[PDB]
Amino acid sequence: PFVCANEKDHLPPLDPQADAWYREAAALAKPDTLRPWGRIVEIYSKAVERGHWKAMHNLANLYRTGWPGGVEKDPQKALDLYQKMIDLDVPQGFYDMGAMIGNRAGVKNPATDGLTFLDKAASLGNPPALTELGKLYIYVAKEKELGLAYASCASSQGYAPASYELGSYYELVENNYPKALSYYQVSVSQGGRSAAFFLSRVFGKRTPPSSAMWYTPDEKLEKFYYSLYLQIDADPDLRFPNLVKYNPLPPHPVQGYDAARPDW
């Protein structure tokens, strides 16, 4: 049996000073201009000293995925930070470690209680882990019902890539385009860059009909959702918690609001 967990129920405390440093360093790394990476690294490091689990994640990603002139690529330090995270039982830490050394390596790790890294992370409600496992059950193991449950758990926690993956599932596998559109719009409200980009294409004049899912082009929706794409592209922390309720999507010309029930 699968139990959907809430990741926020399993987050260690965040030091108030370390969180101030983390937020400033994350902001400095945000704009698409010249950025002070050496100083961003140093600020993240000071926050890591005080136990900030998000500073550990961001700094580790910089150490393994370097950055042209700023920093500096070093996989071993990124992994030492991942170790610090799982020692604190951070759900993202289990996902991060598994993404770097493989899922099944978790079974032997003392911090996972015998689970794989994805299983341990997903059991603590980690949305990235729930999303990957959902894709694996759906597309590799052919466990549709279980895989959809994993993705829906991550989606209901506000994780935009999970909502986008559910929308992509209903478009390509079930050909339920109104259901796909609704998940894409949910993903946009959750800061989904890809969903906003492709939701905009759905209503563009020049989009081939199959990629538009045979919706009628709507120039105002094309511009509305391309505008959200640009906002999310500039600020990935942006959310739109009122987007769905006050901007109902148009029905599909044939499938309505649900291909299963095209006349609702």
Side-chain angles (χ1 to χ4, degrees), residues 175 177 202 208-216 252-254:
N175 290 285
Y177 306 145
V202 164
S210 59
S211 320
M213 288 175 279
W214 294 276
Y215 277 85
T216 305
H252 187 280
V254 189

Side-chain angles (χ1 to χ4, degrees), residues 118-253:
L118 282 171
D119 271 22
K120 179 55 174 186
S123 76
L124 298 175
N126 178 250
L130 292 159
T131 299
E132 170 165 351
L133 283 177
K135 291 164 71 59
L136 294 176
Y137 281 121
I138 288 176
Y139 295 103
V140 174
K142 307 314 192 328
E143 298 215 63
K144 160 184 167 294
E145 182 181 287
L146 180 59
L148 288 173
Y150 270 76
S152 304
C153 184
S155 176
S156 65
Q157 285 184 69
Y159 189 59
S163 306
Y164 177 71
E165 286 287 342
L166 283 161
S168 186
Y169 170 82
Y170 284 101
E171 167 187 8
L172 302 171
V173 179
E174 304 212 338
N175 290 285
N176 188 340
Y177 306 145
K179 226 183 191 182
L181 271 201
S182 76
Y183 274 108
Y184 288 156
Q185 178 189 57
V186 166
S187 180
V188 179
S189 71
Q190 299 169 338
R193 183 185 184 254
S194 289
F197 179 84
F198 287 108
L199 198 37
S200 179
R201 273 180 70 84
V202 164
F203 301 104
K205 301 172 179 216
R206 303 183 143 255
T207 304
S210 59
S211 320
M213 288 175 279
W214 294 276
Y215 277 85
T216 305
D218 186 290
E219 168 263 9
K220 103 160 188 300
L221 292 170
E222 169 184 19
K223 292 170 169 262
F224 175 74
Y225 284 109
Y226 196 75
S227 192
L228 295 176
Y229 160 73
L230 295 179
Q231 295 179 56
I232 294 170
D233 180 71
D235 190 353
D237 296 325
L238 215 49
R239 302 295 184 264
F240 309 94
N242 287 313
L243 171 63
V244 170
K245 51 201 74 178
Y246 292 110
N247 298 269
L249 297 161
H252 187 280

Side-chain angles (χ1 to χ4, degrees), residues 80-124:
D80 299 342
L81 294 174
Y82 295 150
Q83 185 65 51
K84 284 176 183 166
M85 299 175 64
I86 64 182
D87 291 341
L88 299 175
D89 219 54
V90 177
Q92 184 66 37
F94 296 102
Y95 178 89
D96 289 344
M97 187 74 76
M100 209 183 178
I101 73 172
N103 186 29
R104 74 166 44 77
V107 175
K108 53 184 186 167
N109 197 287
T112 66
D113 310 303
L115 304 177
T116 68
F117 282 124
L118 282 171
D119 271 22
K120 179 55 174 186
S123 76
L124 298 175

Side-chain angles (χ1 to χ4, degrees), residues 9-37:
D9 285 327
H10 305 93
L11 306 185
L14 286 186
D15 181 87
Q17 174 69 98
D19 199 54
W21 291 339
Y22 163 79
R23 293 193 193 285
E24 179 183 8
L28 290 166
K30 215 185 259 187
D32 172 33
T33 50
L34 197 57
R35 281 156 285 186
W37 290 110

